PDB file of C-alpha atoms in Angstrom:
ATOM      1  CA  UNK A 205       0.000   0.000   0.000  1.00  0.00           C
ATOM      2  CA  UNK A 206       0.976   3.467  -1.112  1.00  0.00           C
ATOM      3  CA  UNK A 207       3.489   6.127   0.038  1.00  0.00           C
ATOM      4  CA  UNK A 208       4.926   4.331   3.202  1.00  0.00           C
ATOM      5  CA  UNK A 209       1.874   5.854   4.766  1.00  0.00           C
ATOM      6  CA  UNK A 210      -1.314   5.197   2.762  1.00  0.00           C
ATOM      7  CA  UNK A 211      -3.558   2.201   2.090  1.00  0.00           C
ATOM      8  CA  UNK A 212      -5.988   1.089  -0.690  1.00  0.00           C
ATOM      9  CA  UNK A 213      -9.684   0.132  -1.226  1.00  0.00           C
ATOM     10  CA  UNK A 214     -12.547  -0.381  -3.714  1.00  0.00           C
ATOM     11  CA  UNK A 215     -14.117   2.899  -4.896  1.00  0.00           C
ATOM     12  CA  UNK A 216      -9.514   8.021 -14.514  1.00  0.00           C
ATOM     13  CA  UNK A 217     -10.625   6.065 -11.376  1.00  0.00           C
ATOM     14  CA  UNK A 218     -11.162   6.583  -7.587  1.00  0.00           C
ATOM     15  CA  UNK A 219     -10.492   4.342  -4.531  1.00  0.00           C
ATOM     16  CA  UNK A 220     -11.225   4.588  -0.809  1.00  0.00           C
ATOM     17  CA  UNK A 221      -8.019   4.796   1.164  1.00  0.00           C
ATOM     18  CA  UNK A 222      -6.633   5.762   4.537  1.00  0.00           C
ATOM     19  CA  UNK A 223      -4.039   8.219   5.740  1.00  0.00           C
ATOM     20  CA  UNK A 224      -2.882   5.584   8.177  1.00  0.00           C
ATOM     21  CA  UNK A 225      -0.563   7.922  10.088  1.00  0.00           C
ATOM     22  CA  UNK A 226      -3.313  10.404  10.917  1.00  0.00           C
ATOM     23  CA  UNK A 227      -6.350   8.131  10.896  1.00  0.00           C
ATOM     24  CA  UNK A 228      -8.351   9.709   8.102  1.00  0.00           C
ATOM     25  CA  UNK A 229     -10.098   8.169   5.077  1.00  0.00           C
ATOM     26  CA  UNK A 230      -8.937   9.447   1.660  1.00  0.00           C
ATOM     27  CA  UNK A 231      -9.805   9.159  -2.038  1.00  0.00           C
ATOM     28  CA  UNK A 232      -7.036   7.714  -4.189  1.00  0.00           C
ATOM     29  CA  UNK A 233      -7.205   8.291  -7.935  1.00  0.00           C
ATOM     30  CA  UNK A 234      -4.873   5.906  -9.827  1.00  0.00           C
ATOM     31  CA  UNK A 235      -3.565   5.903 -13.421  1.00  0.00           C
ATOM     32  CA  UNK A 236      -1.551   3.204 -15.232  1.00  0.00           C
ATOM     33  CA  UNK A 237       1.927   4.692 -15.730  1.00  0.00           C
ATOM     34  CA  UNK A 238      -0.761  10.955 -19.362  1.00  0.00           C
ATOM     35  CA  UNK A 239      -3.306  12.888 -17.258  1.00  0.00           C
ATOM     36  CA  UNK A 240      -3.141  12.357 -13.462  1.00  0.00           C
ATOM     37  CA  UNK A 241       0.076  14.341 -12.992  1.00  0.00           C
ATOM     38  CA  UNK A 242      -1.329  17.227 -15.044  1.00  0.00           C
ATOM     39  CA  UNK A 243      -4.589  17.494 -13.149  1.00  0.00           C
ATOM     40  CA  UNK A 244      -2.482  17.073  -9.995  1.00  0.00           C
ATOM     41  CA  UNK A 245      -0.675  20.246 -10.924  1.00  0.00           C
ATOM     42  CA  UNK A 246      -3.788  22.291 -11.560  1.00  0.00           C
ATOM     43  CA  UNK A 247      -5.145  21.234  -8.178  1.00  0.00           C
ATOM     44  CA  UNK A 248      -1.998  22.647  -6.580  1.00  0.00           C
ATOM     45  CA  UNK A 249      -2.526  26.073  -8.104  1.00  0.00           C
ATOM     46  CA  UNK A 250      -6.169  25.765  -6.890  1.00  0.00           C
ATOM     47  CA  UNK A 251      -5.074  24.650  -3.443  1.00  0.00           C
ATOM     48  CA  UNK A 252      -6.225  26.385  -0.289  1.00  0.00           C
ATOM     49  CA  UNK A 253      -9.292  27.738  -2.036  1.00  0.00           C
ATOM     50  CA  UNK A 254     -12.797  27.173  -0.664  1.00  0.00           C
ATOM     51  CA  UNK A 255     -14.462  24.222  -2.355  1.00  0.00           C
ATOM     52  CA  UNK A 256     -11.333  22.836  -3.948  1.00  0.00           C
ATOM     53  CA  UNK A 257     -10.306  19.408  -2.658  1.00  0.00           C
ATOM     54  CA  UNK A 258      -6.961  19.123  -0.909  1.00  0.00           C
ATOM     55  CA  UNK A 259      -4.254  16.940  -2.449  1.00  0.00           C
ATOM     56  CA  UNK A 260      -2.245  15.127   0.182  1.00  0.00           C
ATOM     57  CA  UNK A 261       0.228  13.374  -2.077  1.00  0.00           C
ATOM     58  CA  UNK A 262       1.438  12.828  -5.677  1.00  0.00           C
ATOM     59  CA  UNK A 263       3.786  10.011  -6.588  1.00  0.00           C
ATOM     60  CA  UNK A 264       4.135   6.577  -8.204  1.00  0.00           C
ATOM     61  CA  UNK A 265       3.820   3.029  -6.831  1.00  0.00           C
ATOM     62  CA  UNK A 266       4.599   0.055  -9.022  1.00  0.00           C
ATOM     63  CA  UNK A 267       2.689   0.537 -12.278  1.00  0.00           C
ATOM     64  CA  UNK A 268       0.607   3.519 -11.220  1.00  0.00           C
ATOM     65  CA  UNK A 269       0.823   7.244 -10.718  1.00  0.00           C
ATOM     66  CA  UNK A 270      -1.071   7.811  -7.486  1.00  0.00           C
ATOM     67  CA  UNK A 271      -2.764  10.999  -6.402  1.00  0.00           C
ATOM     68  CA  UNK A 272      -4.162  11.066  -2.857  1.00  0.00           C
ATOM     69  CA  UNK A 273      -7.042  13.480  -2.273  1.00  0.00           C
ATOM     70  CA  UNK A 274      -9.323  14.320   0.615  1.00  0.00           C
ATOM     71  CA  UNK A 275     -12.443  12.181   0.754  1.00  0.00           C
ATOM     72  CA  UNK A 276     -15.558  14.041  -0.370  1.00  0.00           C
ATOM     73  CA  UNK A 277     -19.260  13.329  -0.296  1.00  0.00           C
ATOM     74  CA  UNK A 278     -21.939  12.520  -2.928  1.00  0.00           C
ATOM     75  CA  UNK A 279     -22.274  14.306  -6.269  1.00  0.00           C
ATOM     76  CA  UNK A 280     -25.167  16.668  -6.958  1.00  0.00           C
ATOM     77  CA  UNK A 281     -26.367  14.202  -9.589  1.00  0.00           C
ATOM     78  CA  UNK A 282     -26.306  11.518  -6.920  1.00  0.00           C
ATOM     79  CA  UNK A 283     -28.099  13.663  -4.304  1.00  0.00           C
ATOM     80  CA  UNK A 284     -30.585  14.737  -6.982  1.00  0.00           C
ATOM     81  CA  UNK A 285     -31.371  11.126  -7.813  1.00  0.00           C
ATOM     82  CA  UNK A 286     -31.772  10.289  -4.121  1.00  0.00           C
ATOM     83  CA  UNK A 287     -34.137  13.224  -3.939  1.00  0.00           C
ATOM     84  CA  UNK A 288     -36.309  11.850  -6.738  1.00  0.00           C
ATOM     85  CA  UNK A 289     -34.839  14.273  -9.206  1.00  0.00           C
ATOM     86  CA  UNK A 290     -36.571  17.191  -7.566  1.00  0.00           C
ATOM     87  CA  UNK A 291     -34.890  19.941  -5.532  1.00  0.00           C
ATOM     88  CA  UNK A 292     -36.780  22.688  -3.703  1.00  0.00           C
ATOM     89  CA  UNK A 293     -36.249  26.328  -4.686  1.00  0.00           C
ATOM     90  CA  UNK A 294     -34.305  26.977  -1.496  1.00  0.00           C
ATOM     91  CA  UNK A 295     -31.938  24.133  -2.327  1.00  0.00           C
ATOM     92  CA  UNK A 296     -31.254  25.355  -5.884  1.00  0.00           C
ATOM     93  CA  UNK A 297     -30.560  28.857  -4.590  1.00  0.00           C
ATOM     94  CA  UNK A 298     -28.269  27.594  -1.815  1.00  0.00           C
ATOM     95  CA  UNK A 299     -26.388  25.561  -4.398  1.00  0.00           C
ATOM     96  CA  UNK A 300     -26.471  28.423  -6.923  1.00  0.00           C
ATOM     97  CA  UNK A 301     -24.620  30.710  -4.520  1.00  0.00           C
ATOM     98  CA  UNK A 302     -21.649  28.419  -3.826  1.00  0.00           C
ATOM     99  CA  UNK A 303     -21.334  27.107  -7.378  1.00  0.00           C
ATOM    100  CA  UNK A 304     -20.991  30.558  -8.883  1.00  0.00           C
ATOM    101  CA  UNK A 305     -18.342  31.229  -6.207  1.00  0.00           C
ATOM    102  CA  UNK A 306     -16.407  28.075  -7.092  1.00  0.00           C
ATOM    103  CA  UNK A 307     -16.387  28.951 -10.755  1.00  0.00           C
ATOM    104  CA  UNK A 308     -15.245  32.485  -9.993  1.00  0.00           C
ATOM    105  CA  UNK A 309     -12.448  31.090  -7.841  1.00  0.00           C
ATOM    106  CA  UNK A 310     -11.220  28.756 -10.563  1.00  0.00           C
ATOM    107  CA  UNK A 311     -11.316  31.666 -12.985  1.00  0.00           C
ATOM    108  CA  UNK A 312      -9.455  33.782 -10.444  1.00  0.00           C
ATOM    109  CA  UNK A 313      -6.684  31.178 -10.668  1.00  0.00           C
ATOM    110  CA  UNK A 314      -6.405  31.526 -14.450  1.00  0.00           C
ATOM    111  CA  UNK A 315      -8.291  28.377 -15.452  1.00  0.00           C
ATOM    112  CA  UNK A 316     -11.742  27.720 -16.870  1.00  0.00           C
ATOM    113  CA  UNK A 317     -13.373  24.382 -16.141  1.00  0.00           C
ATOM    114  CA  UNK A 318     -15.169  23.506 -19.400  1.00  0.00           C
ATOM    115  CA  UNK A 319     -17.023  20.626 -17.735  1.00  0.00           C
ATOM    116  CA  UNK A 320     -19.655  22.079 -15.427  1.00  0.00           C
ATOM    117  CA  UNK A 321     -22.383  19.518 -14.671  1.00  0.00           C
ATOM    118  CA  UNK A 322     -24.032  17.970 -11.548  1.00  0.00           C
ATOM    119  CA  UNK A 323     -21.512  15.114 -11.454  1.00  0.00           C
ATOM    120  CA  UNK A 324     -18.572  17.472 -11.040  1.00  0.00           C
ATOM    121  CA  UNK A 325     -20.042  19.084  -7.962  1.00  0.00           C
ATOM    122  CA  UNK A 326     -19.662  17.039  -4.774  1.00  0.00           C
ATOM    123  CA  UNK A 327     -20.743  17.896  -1.220  1.00  0.00           C
ATOM    124  CA  UNK A 328     -18.115  17.655   1.510  1.00  0.00           C
ATOM    125  CA  UNK A 329     -18.095  15.305   4.517  1.00  0.00           C
ATOM    126  CA  UNK A 330     -18.473  16.098   8.207  1.00  0.00           C
ATOM    127  CA  UNK A 331     -17.994  19.741   9.116  1.00  0.00           C
ATOM    128  CA  UNK A 332     -17.707  20.430   5.388  1.00  0.00           C
ATOM    129  CA  UNK A 333     -20.885  18.577   4.401  1.00  0.00           C
ATOM    130  CA  UNK A 334     -22.541  21.970   3.801  1.00  0.00           C
ATOM    131  CA  UNK A 335     -19.718  22.843   1.404  1.00  0.00           C
ATOM    132  CA  UNK A 336     -20.104  22.497  -2.368  1.00  0.00           C
ATOM    133  CA  UNK A 337     -16.801  21.317  -3.924  1.00  0.00           C
ATOM    134  CA  UNK A 338     -15.814  21.316  -7.563  1.00  0.00           C
ATOM    135  CA  UNK A 339     -13.780  18.473  -9.038  1.00  0.00           C
ATOM    136  CA  UNK A 340     -12.457  16.921 -12.227  1.00  0.00           C
ATOM    137  CA  UNK A 341     -10.043  19.329 -13.836  1.00  0.00           C
ATOM    138  CA  UNK A 342      -9.309  16.857 -16.619  1.00  0.00           C
ATOM    139  CA  UNK A 343     -10.765  19.232 -19.200  1.00  0.00           C
ATOM    140  CA  UNK A 344      -9.668  22.430 -17.451  1.00  0.00           C
ATOM    141  CA  UNK A 345      -7.606  24.894 -19.500  1.00  0.00           C
ATOM    142  CA  UNK A 346      -5.782  28.160 -18.594  1.00  0.00           C
ATOM    143  CA  UNK A 347      -7.680  30.924 -20.457  1.00  0.00           C
ATOM    144  CA  UNK A 348      -5.194  33.632 -19.719  1.00  0.00           C
ATOM    145  CA  UNK A 349      -1.469  33.965 -19.068  1.00  0.00           C
ATOM    146  CA  UNK A 350      -0.656  33.878 -15.324  1.00  0.00           C
ATOM    147  CA  UNK A 351       1.539  36.983 -15.371  1.00  0.00           C
ATOM    148  CA  UNK A 352       0.163  39.203 -18.132  1.00  0.00           C
ATOM    149  CA  UNK A 353      -3.376  37.919 -17.827  1.00  0.00           C
ATOM    150  CA  UNK A 354      -3.438  37.805 -21.614  1.00  0.00           C
ATOM    151  CA  UNK A 355      -6.682  36.151 -22.604  1.00  0.00           C
ATOM    152  CA  UNK A 356      -6.306  33.267 -25.076  1.00  0.00           C
ATOM    153  CA  UNK A 357      -7.334  33.872 -28.699  1.00  0.00           C
ATOM    154  CA  UNK A 358     -10.839  33.567 -30.049  1.00  0.00           C
ATOM    155  CA  UNK A 359     -10.934  30.281 -31.991  1.00  0.00           C
ATOM    156  CA  UNK A 360     -13.516  28.668 -34.251  1.00  0.00           C
ATOM    157  CA  UNK A 361     -14.794  25.432 -35.731  1.00  0.00           C
ATOM    158  CA  UNK A 362     -13.672  23.503 -32.672  1.00  0.00           C
ATOM    159  CA  UNK A 363     -15.025  20.101 -31.730  1.00  0.00           C
ATOM    160  CA  UNK A 364     -17.191  19.999 -28.588  1.00  0.00           C
ATOM    161  CA  UNK A 365     -15.042  19.148 -25.548  1.00  0.00           C
ATOM    162  CA  UNK A 366     -17.389  18.432 -22.661  1.00  0.00           C
ATOM    163  CA  UNK A 367     -20.920  17.112 -22.085  1.00  0.00           C
ATOM    164  CA  UNK A 368     -23.419  18.241 -24.713  1.00  0.00           C
ATOM    165  CA  UNK A 369     -26.291  18.471 -22.257  1.00  0.00           C
ATOM    166  CA  UNK A 370     -24.743  21.340 -20.328  1.00  0.00           C
ATOM    167  CA  UNK A 371     -22.518  22.851 -23.050  1.00  0.00           C
ATOM    168  CA  UNK A 372     -23.004  26.525 -23.941  1.00  0.00           C
ATOM    169  CA  UNK A 373     -24.493  27.541 -27.277  1.00  0.00           C
ATOM    170  CA  UNK A 374     -21.208  29.114 -28.376  1.00  0.00           C
ATOM    171  CA  UNK A 375     -19.670  25.731 -27.601  1.00  0.00           C
ATOM    172  CA  UNK A 376     -22.129  24.078 -29.965  1.00  0.00           C
ATOM    173  CA  UNK A 377     -21.220  26.635 -32.597  1.00  0.00           C
ATOM    174  CA  UNK A 378     -17.566  25.615 -32.272  1.00  0.00           C
ATOM    175  CA  UNK A 379     -16.263  28.702 -30.444  1.00  0.00           C
ATOM    176  CA  UNK A 380     -13.375  28.575 -27.970  1.00  0.00           C
ATOM    177  CA  UNK A 381     -14.674  28.245 -24.414  1.00  0.00           C
ATOM    178  CA  UNK A 382     -14.008  31.077 -21.974  1.00  0.00           C
ATOM    179  CA  UNK A 383     -15.242  32.190 -18.549  1.00  0.00           C
ATOM    180  CA  UNK A 384     -18.725  32.984 -19.849  1.00  0.00           C
ATOM    181  CA  UNK A 385     -19.272  29.357 -20.902  1.00  0.00           C
ATOM    182  CA  UNK A 386     -18.598  27.918 -17.448  1.00  0.00           C
ATOM    183  CA  UNK A 387     -21.379  30.226 -16.224  1.00  0.00           C
ATOM    184  CA  UNK A 388     -23.789  29.343 -19.031  1.00  0.00           C
ATOM    185  CA  UNK A 389     -23.352  25.689 -18.192  1.00  0.00           C
ATOM    186  CA  UNK A 390     -24.098  26.422 -14.556  1.00  0.00           C
ATOM    187  CA  UNK A 391     -27.261  28.147 -15.684  1.00  0.00           C
ATOM    188  CA  UNK A 392     -28.447  25.080 -17.564  1.00  0.00           C
ATOM    189  CA  UNK A 393     -27.602  22.949 -14.553  1.00  0.00           C
ATOM    190  CA  UNK A 394     -29.763  25.131 -12.351  1.00  0.00           C
ATOM    191  CA  UNK A 395     -32.740  24.686 -14.695  1.00  0.00           C
ATOM    192  CA  UNK A 396     -31.960  20.974 -14.861  1.00  0.00           C
ATOM    193  CA  UNK A 397     -32.377  20.822 -11.082  1.00  0.00           C
ATOM    194  CA  UNK A 398     -35.602  22.853 -11.426  1.00  0.00           C
ATOM    195  CA  UNK A 399     -37.288  20.802 -14.191  1.00  0.00           C
ATOM    196  CA  UNK A 400     -35.869  17.344 -13.495  1.00  0.00           C
ATOM    197  CA  UNK A 401     -34.540  17.294 -17.053  1.00  0.00           C
ATOM    198  CA  UNK A 402     -33.655  19.565 -19.988  1.00  0.00           C
ATOM    199  CA  UNK A 403     -35.722  19.823 -23.186  1.00  0.00           C
ATOM    200  CA  UNK A 404     -32.783  18.701 -25.306  1.00  0.00           C
ATOM    201  CA  UNK A 405     -32.381  15.542 -23.271  1.00  0.00           C
ATOM    202  CA  UNK A 406     -33.127  12.058 -24.566  1.00  0.00           C
ATOM    203  CA  UNK A 407     -33.414  13.237 -28.174  1.00  0.00           C
ATOM    204  CA  UNK A 408     -33.359  10.230 -30.517  1.00  0.00           C
ATOM    205  CA  UNK A 409     -30.067   9.912 -32.311  1.00  0.00           C
ATOM    206  CA  UNK A 410     -28.950   6.865 -34.261  1.00  0.00           C
ATOM    207  CA  UNK A 411     -25.336   8.068 -34.403  1.00  0.00           C
ATOM    208  CA  UNK A 412     -23.275   9.857 -31.763  1.00  0.00           C
ATOM    209  CA  UNK A 413     -22.955  12.924 -33.945  1.00  0.00           C
ATOM    210  CA  UNK A 414     -26.511  13.473 -35.154  1.00  0.00           C
ATOM    211  CA  UNK A 415     -27.141  13.645 -31.424  1.00  0.00           C
ATOM    212  CA  UNK A 416     -24.776  16.582 -30.883  1.00  0.00           C
ATOM    213  CA  UNK A 417     -26.435  18.077 -33.893  1.00  0.00           C
ATOM    214  CA  UNK A 418     -29.942  17.413 -32.631  1.00  0.00           C
ATOM    215  CA  UNK A 419     -29.100  18.898 -29.224  1.00  0.00           C
ATOM    216  CA  UNK A 420     -27.456  21.973 -30.755  1.00  0.00           C
ATOM    217  CA  UNK A 421     -30.465  22.442 -33.043  1.00  0.00           C
ATOM    218  CA  UNK A 422     -32.877  22.025 -30.140  1.00  0.00           C
ATOM    219  CA  UNK A 423     -30.912  24.125 -27.655  1.00  0.00           C
ATOM    220  CA  UNK A 424     -30.893  27.021 -30.073  1.00  0.00           C
ATOM    221  CA  UNK A 425     -34.559  26.565 -30.939  1.00  0.00           C
ATOM    222  CA  UNK A 426     -35.668  26.859 -27.308  1.00  0.00           C
ATOM    223  CA  UNK A 427     -35.911  30.486 -26.179  1.00  0.00           C
ATOM    224  CA  UNK A 428     -34.963  31.146 -22.546  1.00  0.00           C
ATOM    225  CA  UNK A 429     -38.498  32.280 -21.566  1.00  0.00           C
ATOM    226  CA  UNK A 430     -39.813  28.902 -22.676  1.00  0.00           C
ATOM    227  CA  UNK A 431     -37.064  26.986 -20.896  1.00  0.00           C
ATOM    228  CA  UNK A 432     -37.617  28.894 -17.688  1.00  0.00           C
ATOM    229  CA  UNK A 433     -41.400  29.092 -17.865  1.00  0.00           C
ATOM    230  CA  UNK A 434     -42.954  28.458 -14.480  1.00  0.00           C
ATOM    231  CA  UNK A 435     -39.920  29.502 -12.454  1.00  0.00           C
ATOM    232  CA  UNK A 436     -38.512  32.627 -10.850  1.00  0.00           C
ATOM    233  CA  UNK A 437     -37.480  35.118 -13.543  1.00  0.00           C
ATOM    234  CA  UNK A 438     -34.019  35.146 -11.914  1.00  0.00           C
ATOM    235  CA  UNK A 439     -33.103  31.944 -13.722  1.00  0.00           C
ATOM    236  CA  UNK A 440     -34.025  33.443 -17.116  1.00  0.00           C
ATOM    237  CA  UNK A 441     -32.246  36.728 -16.336  1.00  0.00           C
ATOM    238  CA  UNK A 442     -29.144  34.753 -15.397  1.00  0.00           C
ATOM    239  CA  UNK A 443     -29.070  32.725 -18.602  1.00  0.00           C
ATOM    240  CA  UNK A 444     -29.661  35.855 -20.641  1.00  0.00           C
ATOM    241  CA  UNK A 445     -26.852  37.663 -18.827  1.00  0.00           C
ATOM    242  CA  UNK A 446     -24.458  34.822 -19.645  1.00  0.00           C
ATOM    243  CA  UNK A 447     -25.455  34.662 -23.338  1.00  0.00           C
ATOM    244  CA  UNK A 448     -24.589  38.341 -23.573  1.00  0.00           C
ATOM    245  CA  UNK A 449     -21.028  38.058 -22.225  1.00  0.00           C
ATOM    246  CA  UNK A 450     -18.299  38.907 -24.716  1.00  0.00           C
ATOM    247  CA  UNK A 451     -15.689  36.177 -25.267  1.00  0.00           C
ATOM    248  CA  UNK A 452     -13.060  37.928 -23.203  1.00  0.00           C
ATOM    249  CA  UNK A 453     -15.297  39.570 -20.588  1.00  0.00           C
ATOM    250  CA  UNK A 454     -14.724  39.255 -16.877  1.00  0.00           C
ATOM    251  CA  UNK A 455     -18.163  38.080 -15.704  1.00  0.00           C
ATOM    252  CA  UNK A 456     -19.772  40.181 -12.980  1.00  0.00           C
ATOM    253  CA  UNK A 457     -20.060  37.259 -10.548  1.00  0.00           C
ATOM    254  CA  UNK A 458     -21.335  39.470  -7.700  1.00  0.00           C
ATOM    255  CA  UNK A 459     -24.292  40.582  -9.779  1.00  0.00           C
ATOM    256  CA  UNK A 460     -25.233  36.992 -10.461  1.00  0.00           C
ATOM    257  CA  UNK A 461     -25.061  35.919  -6.815  1.00  0.00           C
ATOM    258  CA  UNK A 462     -26.969  39.000  -5.697  1.00  0.00           C
ATOM    259  CA  UNK A 463     -29.540  38.113  -8.333  1.00  0.00           C
ATOM    260  CA  UNK A 464     -30.367  34.856  -6.623  1.00  0.00           C
ATOM    261  CA  UNK A 465     -29.751  36.159  -3.103  1.00  0.00           C
ATOM    262  CA  UNK A 466     -32.484  38.739  -3.630  1.00  0.00           C
ATOM    263  CA  UNK A 467     -34.919  36.063  -4.861  1.00  0.00           C
ATOM    264  CA  UNK A 468     -33.790  34.116  -1.806  1.00  0.00           C
ATOM    265  CA  UNK A 469     -34.489  36.852   0.748  1.00  0.00           C
ATOM    266  CA  UNK A 470     -37.734  37.588  -1.050  1.00  0.00           C
ATOM    267  CA  UNK A 471     -38.842  34.018  -0.441  1.00  0.00           C
ATOM    268  CA  UNK A 472     -37.936  34.434   3.207  1.00  0.00           C
ATOM    269  CA  UNK A 473     -35.243  31.776   2.977  1.00  0.00           C
ATOM    270  CA  UNK A 474     -32.186  31.923   5.265  1.00  0.00           C
ATOM    271  CA  UNK A 475     -28.672  30.680   4.560  1.00  0.00           C
ATOM    272  CA  UNK A 476     -28.769  27.957   7.215  1.00  0.00           C
ATOM    273  CA  UNK A 477     -27.383  25.368   4.776  1.00  0.00           C
ATOM    274  CA  UNK A 478     -30.189  22.866   5.225  1.00  0.00           C
ATOM    275  CA  UNK A 479     -30.449  21.149   1.833  1.00  0.00           C
ATOM    276  CA  UNK A 480     -33.332  18.888   0.847  1.00  0.00           C
ATOM    277  CA  UNK A 481     -31.169  15.826   1.347  1.00  0.00           C
ATOM    278  CA  UNK A 482     -30.342  17.012   4.860  1.00  0.00           C
ATOM    279  CA  UNK A 483     -34.024  16.332   5.649  1.00  0.00           C
ATOM    280  CA  UNK A 484     -34.461  12.765   4.464  1.00  0.00           C
ATOM    281  CA  UNK A 485     -35.262  10.624   7.487  1.00  0.00           C
TER     282      UNK A 485
END
């Protein structure tokens, strides 16, 4: 077992381990001896930030490059399923606050995620179980130069790198992903939590390419008022804000959070961090 002081378990992959010298359970992502070491380096730049998992060790053991991370809880997709694929308004708004903040933090560290979906958002454990974490930086890219903060170039005709359900419209059009896209994906995820599904979900596609084309076609045929019908106008306003962001714009994160926070206070909700799942007996 790994690092003179770690041990392995059951569960590109994750395993349940133990920091045997400090008595704590840990997640151990292994990779045949290239992408673990890279992600491992992005995590380091992200380190210390709120909602970013801590990396306790990076090395190699036999035929594997091992990365030891702090154990985290269930994914929002998982909690959503457990909740019958239905979250209350208070829960979406509580999640909406922290998620925006995680995305802004990642952007503040020069990277963009490019893979924002319910599965890449996991709740913490213990004292942190009220903390929304962001994971999987496998598709993360620096969008600006660390020192000069020179934004990457606008590029076209690219192939979709991510998950078509939550991808931004500009991503479907082939445009280079930037900060705005991470936020547009979050917006679709918030409506996903609100409706239980997205209108461009489960579209029939014989091939895995007429699908991306059916989604794209559908996602651009569905105006935001129709997608958000029956919900607080805040969700529509948010999506519209995101669709208006210029490729190199610094998103006004505060305005987005205050958008939801006002809908929050208006509903009488309080930030006590009691999620729907926290009430399942």
